[PDB]
């Protein structure tokens, strides 16, 4: 199968590997990585080597946030390697941000969006991205991308107005970089404000 999936949980990259079991059932795996500049420096993540875990998380292991870390998995069947697939993921293309909790309060005429982002200082982390607040009032799909600078350091408060009573809106939290490709449409939260 060699299906690799990565998810960003509070600025932390967690990667999991989906493997099917036809006949042989490997319970242990090993994950290795490297930069896209030169696939000559193969490195392995500690704890994520010869382990029974199906996922590996890192914090500062990935210093090249502005690069594409190549992914390689070594499938071991007991005491012998079975297969090894090669893949590659671009952080500026994926950056799947779903774990962060988001709340929304619907008032008589305005909507108070409150996204709960990890409390961190932006002056201590290189994060180039454009967070977009998806809106869907009464079926009308809209997208709003405000100033992320100094606003993604915690509770992202956004006010949506210019609407009328009885507006059911579904808010989603996704982000864009170069274009609308990283459409990480998180579970749309539908809320209805006072009707009329």
């Amino acid at each position: 199968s060699c299906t690799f999936k990565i998810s960003l949980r509070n600025f932390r990259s967690i990667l999991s590997w989906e493997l099917k079991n036809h006949s042989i059932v490997p319970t242990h795996y090993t994950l290795l990585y490297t930069i896209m500049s030169k696939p000559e420096d193969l490195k392995v993540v500690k704890n994520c080597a010869n382990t029974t875990r199906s996922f590996c998380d890192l914090t500062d292991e990935w210093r090249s946030t502005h690069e594409a870390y190549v992914t390689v998995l070594e499938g071991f069947s007991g005491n012998t390697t079975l297969f090894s697939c090669s893949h590659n993921f671009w952080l500026a293309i994926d950056m799947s941000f779903e774990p962060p909790e988001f709340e929304i309060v619907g008032f008589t005429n305005h909507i108070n969006v409150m996204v709960k982002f990890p409390s961190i200082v932006e002056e201590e982390l290189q994060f180039d991205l454009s967070l977009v607040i998806e809106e869907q009032s009464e079926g009308i799909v809209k997208k709003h991308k405000p100033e992320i600078k100094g606003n993604m350091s915690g509770n992202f408060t956004y006010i949506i107005d210019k609407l009328i009573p009885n507006t059911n809106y579904c808010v989603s939290v996704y982000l864009e970089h170069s274009d609308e490709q990283a459409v990480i449409k998180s579970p749309l939260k539908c809320t209805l404000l006072p009707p009329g």
Binding site: I35, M36, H87, A92, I93
Partner: protein, 165 residues
């Protein structure tokens, strides 16, 4: 010239174009690969605010020329290359704009050209490898990866906000 640091889409777009320009998996190319030695001391060191602008201008020029070659145009997709040439020229104009205006860009000594020379030499090594590899797709993939790694770290001067110390 871009005095206020509001945002930037140039590097982002160019970066994306190079991503869609992929043909195969990079890890599948563990042969036609070799450290070309991307100069960083003449990019991130010393050169920061506007200082690296003259370098970037000639650097993108090298990228443009290299990708506009009949060899490169026959390795990648012309549809993607079309926009690539456009974006490159767009950013080229953006960079030289600061050189056209009376901004403190070309104020540095011969070091402002020294960094450029390093780029020309770096690309020369790349072209040399391409010649030997007969411009094979595997080689192009790695070469493109190098250009991708270098270009990102080129505009990274302003995109860098990880360590203030």
């Amino acid at each position: 010239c871009d005095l206020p640091q509001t945002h930037s889409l140039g590097s982002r777009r160019t970066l994306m174009l190079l991503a869609q320009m992929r043909k195969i998996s990079l890890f599948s190319c563990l042969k036609d690969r070799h450290d070309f030695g991307f100069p960083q001391e003449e990019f991130g060191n010393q050169f920061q605010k506007a200082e690296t602008i003259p370098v970037l201008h000639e650097m993108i020029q090298q990228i443009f020329n290299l990708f506009s070659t009949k060899d490169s145009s026959a390795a990648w997709d012309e549809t993607l290359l079309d926009k690539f040439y456009t974006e490159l020229y767009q950013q080229l104009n953006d960079l030289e704009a600061c050189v056209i205006q009376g901004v403190g860009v070309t104020e540095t000594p011969l070091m402002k050209e020294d960094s450029i020379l390093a780029v020309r030499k770096y690309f020369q090594r790349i072209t040399l490898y391409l010649k030997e590899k007969k411009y094979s797709p595997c080689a192009w993939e790695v070469v493109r990866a190098e250009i991708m790694r270098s270009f990102s770290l080129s505009t990274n001067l302003q995109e860098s906000l990880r360590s203030k110390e």
